Amino acid sequence: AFAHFVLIHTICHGAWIWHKLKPLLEALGHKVTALDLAASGVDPRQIEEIGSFDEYSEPLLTFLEALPPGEKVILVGESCGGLNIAIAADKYCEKIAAAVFHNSVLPDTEHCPSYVVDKLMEVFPDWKDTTYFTYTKDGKEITGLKLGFTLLRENLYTLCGPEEYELAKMLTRKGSLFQNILAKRPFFTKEGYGSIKKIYVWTDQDEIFLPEFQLWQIENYKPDKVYKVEGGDHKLQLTKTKEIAEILQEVADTYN
């Protein structure tokens, strides 16, 4: 079967992280959309204009609104992209055949939207040379960050080529987790987000979303299907592109 995959990058990244996976899925016959979220990739906004993870998710919500009645997509979110999936699922669950988490945060419905992020910060507290700043938007102080190049090299792109790590140094932008905004956000709902099929893909070789955090998430909110990719690193769409396309082909053949 063929499906329409919507690939969703993590904070401080853009559609460009999917440049190896998108031609591979298209060579299997799939339709692929790789979005830039607000103030990400070559999106024209700067992060200081964005006041919440929901506003940050606007390109994804706008894309889903533009789907004609009856067209379903498989969302694929990497790293912080699972939060954009949860936001989208509470507005457009009928348009989502399934959601695939790729070394991703897995929000739940029982605890507040910041829960798995708060736990990530406990498991991975030192972000090395990452720099931080604050700005004010809609009466709230938001902490922005720019991922440090040593953190990028050692923990996110550990086994990626120098030309792939070069793209990350050239293209990663200032972003935000909007952690304090998520903490006061209404909980993700059981009827929207809670209802979609959730496939959790991970590697135990991930150097930032460590095995303790990812296994903690799988136990906290049981996925419908779990795929563990052997080897690779946090950016499995670069180090294990072929294995991620094989898994996504299987999801396309299982959920519609």
Distance CA 176, CA 44 (A): 16
Three state DSSP letters for the chain:
CCCEEEEECCCCCCHHHHCCHHHHHHCCCCEEEEECCCCCCCCCCCHHHCCCHHHHCHHHHHHHHCCCCCCCEEEEEECCHHHHHHHHHHHHHHHEEEEEEECCCCCCCCCCCCHHHHHHHHHCCCCCCCEEEEEEECCEEEEEEECCHHHHHHHHCCCCCHHHHHHHHHHCCCEECCHHHHHCCCCCCCCCHHHCCEEEEECCCCCCCCHHHHHHHHHHCCCCEEEECCCCCCCHHHHCHHHHHHHHHHHHHHCC
Q: Give the strand order in the sheet containing 140-146.
A: 131-137, 140-146, 175-176
Rounded to 10 deg, the angle between the 58-65 and 81-92 helix axes is 40
Which residues define the annotated binding site for acetone? 10, 79
Distance CA 119, CA 124 (A): 9
Which residues define the annotated binding site? 10, 79, 235
Can you read off the two tokens belonging to residue 130? 């990452």
Which residues define the annotated binding site for (S)-mandelonitrile? 10, 79
Q: Is 239 left (phi over 0), alpha (psi -120 to 50) or beta?
A: alpha
Give the architecture (CATH level 2) of 1-256.
Answer: 3-Layer(aba) Sandwich (3.40)
* First and final C-alpha spacing in the chain: 9
Can you read off the two tokens belonging to residue 79? 């790293």
The residues annotated with a catalytic role in the active site are 79, 234
CB neighbourhood size of 90 (10 A): 20
All structural domains of the chain with their residue ranges: 1-256
Q: Which experimental approach was used here?
A: X-ray
Q: Are 163 and 171 in contact (CB under 8 A)?
A: no
Q: Is 138 left (phi over 0), alpha (psi -120 to 50) or beta?
A: left
In sign, the C-alpha dihedral spanning 110, 236, 80, 252 is: negative
Tell me the residue type at 195.
S
